Amino acid sequence: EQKTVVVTTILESPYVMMKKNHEMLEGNERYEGYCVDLAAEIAKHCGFKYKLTIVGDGKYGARDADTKIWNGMVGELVYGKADIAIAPLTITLVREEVIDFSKPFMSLGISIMIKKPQKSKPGVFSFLDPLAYEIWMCIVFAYIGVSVVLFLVSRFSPYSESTNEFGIFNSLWFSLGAFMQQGCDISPRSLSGRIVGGVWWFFTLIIISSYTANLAAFLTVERMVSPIESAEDLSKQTEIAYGTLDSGSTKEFFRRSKIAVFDKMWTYMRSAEPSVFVRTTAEGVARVRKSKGKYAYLLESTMNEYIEQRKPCDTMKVGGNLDSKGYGIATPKGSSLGTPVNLAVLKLSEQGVLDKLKNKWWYDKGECGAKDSGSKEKTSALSLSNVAGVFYILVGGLGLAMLVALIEFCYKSR
């Protein structure tokens, strides 16, 4: 007889979600999600009827220490309360000891989440940004060199001669006025001087006309600064607390690791108080959102890559994956379901249905501007905050000139 197989699963977005008409609809229609579509495909390929059920406590869990009492979904499968589990259940060595897994239908790794740092205004002195620091060094050394060669060449006192007005202070003024592309009231009037001037006018031309080119795109830059980038530094500084899900594979992974960085992270997490762990994923996400970015959460990238799809998008991934693991369908040991389930999983992976469902349940429901923001239209006008830095040095120079004038006055008239 067509026995309805007792499926067991857990509510988690977007794998299993309660449809909004659950107050009126009845049966399986109340449940939709990626795992519901996968279960439908599997049942259709195997050709049997099924009844959905939900785990009694919502825990993935493991065997309790020193009692060996299995619980959660694993307890449900070991003790035969259900026939097959279809859920994001990570393959691990301890679970393979008692339950069989199909070949993995999706691959994922550990990922890290923080509250995003909002973009910031450009700095005060962003007008000198388009050119590197060494260029602003060499421009000053070139200015000094031309200034002093032009003095040395004139006023050489041949076989008194004083026709050359180019004292050191007027040669120094001439070189500056020439560089700023402003006029001047004197010219070298001699061949070696004309030679020295003509090269500096070339240098000038080539330099200015290569700095005025890109200046709009530089006064405004939008995005800068981030708190961390490699996510390794969370092992080195205690300014930001972090933790993991309870009764999850991730906690066992960090307990079991022997890499010094992960063992240090575990040693911190295993003794810091108040409790850094959470009972559910969304509680963790809300804690991160509220804690001003002072708290960071570790979760499988299969979740982070969805959390960033949904508004308000105040949180973003960092760093690369620490490892790689797979999800799988699970069955009681020795049950006849295992081999046709494995063949069905293979055939669905070969047909590309899994990718179609991945697009259906990840990218069709994204709304934040990360989906498309490449238009990058021109910024309108040019706000004063972008240019305010130019006025401060002006007023400081006006304030310095008066001081120099007054000290020169009181020095001379004494």
Ligand X SMILES: N[C@@H](CCC(=O)O)C(=O)O
Contacting a copy of itself (CB under 8 A), which of 131, 140, 272, 282? Answer: 131
**Residue 215 found at the interface with a copy of itself (CB under 8 A):** yes
90 annotated to bind ligand = yes
**Residue 8 found at the interface with ligand X (CB under 6 A):** no
**Residue 25 found at the interface with a copy of itself (CB under 8 A):** no
CB distance 124 to 167 below 8 Å: no
Our CA angle for 271, 276, 281, nearest 5°, is 145
| Sequence-separated contacts (24+) of 332-339 with Cβ below 8 Å | 332/77, 332/78, 332/80, 332/83, 332/99, 332/100, 333/98, 333/99, 333/100, 334/100, 335/83, 335/100, 337/5, 337/46, 337/83, 337/84, 338/100, 338/102
x/- track of binding to a copy of itself for residues 56-75 (CB under 8 A)? --------------------
**Residue 243 found at the interface with ligand X (CB under 6 A):** no
**Residue 336 found at the interface with a copy of itself (CB under 8 A):** no
Interface segment toward ligand X; rule CB under 6 A; list 34-42, 123-131, 154-162, 241-249: 241-249
Q: State whether the Cα torsion 321-324-328-334 is positive or negative.
A: negative
Most distant CA atoms of the chain, gap in Å: 127
**Residue 138 found at the interface with a copy of itself (CB under 8 A):** yes
Query: What residues numbered 20-79 form the site for ligand X, per CB under 6 A?
Result: 60
Q: For the stretch 350-361, what's the b/e string if a residue is b when 16 or more beta carbons lie within 10 angstroms of its beta carbon?
A: eeeebeebeeeb
CB 4 → a copy of itself: shortest distance, Å? Answer: 28
158 annotated to bind ligand = no
**Residue 140 found at the interface with a copy of itself (CB under 8 A):** no
**Residue 245 found at the interface with ligand X (CB under 6 A):** yes
Q: Which position has the token pair 């259900």? A: 82
Q: For a copy of itself, give the closer residue by CB, 81 or 194.
A: 194
CB distance 231 to 319 below 8 Å: yes
* Residues 47, 40: Cα–Cα separation, whole Å: 10
CB 405 → a copy of itself: shortest distance, Å? Answer: 4
Our CA angle for 336, 106, 3, nearest 5°, is 30
Contacting a copy of itself (CB under 8 A), which of 5, 142, 240, 313? Answer: 142
CB 244 → ligand X: shortest distance, Å? Answer: 6
**Total number of residues binding ligand X (CB under 6 A)?**
11
* Residues 329, 85: Cα–Cα separation, whole Å: 6
Q: Are strands 99-101 and 330-332 parallel, antiparallel or unpaired?
A: antiparallel
* Residues 389, 228: Cα–Cα separation, whole Å: 29
* Residues 171, 178: Cα–Cα separation, whole Å: 10
Contacting ligand X (CB under 6 A), which of 250, 301, 315, 331? Answer: 250
* Residues 10, 16: Cα–Cα separation, whole Å: 7
CB 232 → ligand X: shortest distance, Å? Answer: 20
CB 60 → ligand X: shortest distance, Å? Answer: 4
Length of the chain equals: 414
* Residues 15, 359: Cα–Cα separation, whole Å: 13
x/- track of binding to a copy of itself for residues 151-190 (CB under 8 A)? -xx--xxxx---------x---x--xxx-xxxxxxxx---
Q: For a copy of itself, give the closer residue by CB, 65 or 384.
A: 384
250 annotated to bind ligand = yes
**Residue 191 found at the interface with a copy of itself (CB under 8 A):** yes
Binding site members? 88, 90, 95, 249-250, 300
Task: Report the binding-site residues for L-glutamate.
Answer: 88, 90, 95, 249-250, 300
Which positions touch ligand X (CB under 6 A)? Answer: 60, 88-90, 244-245, 248-250, 299-300
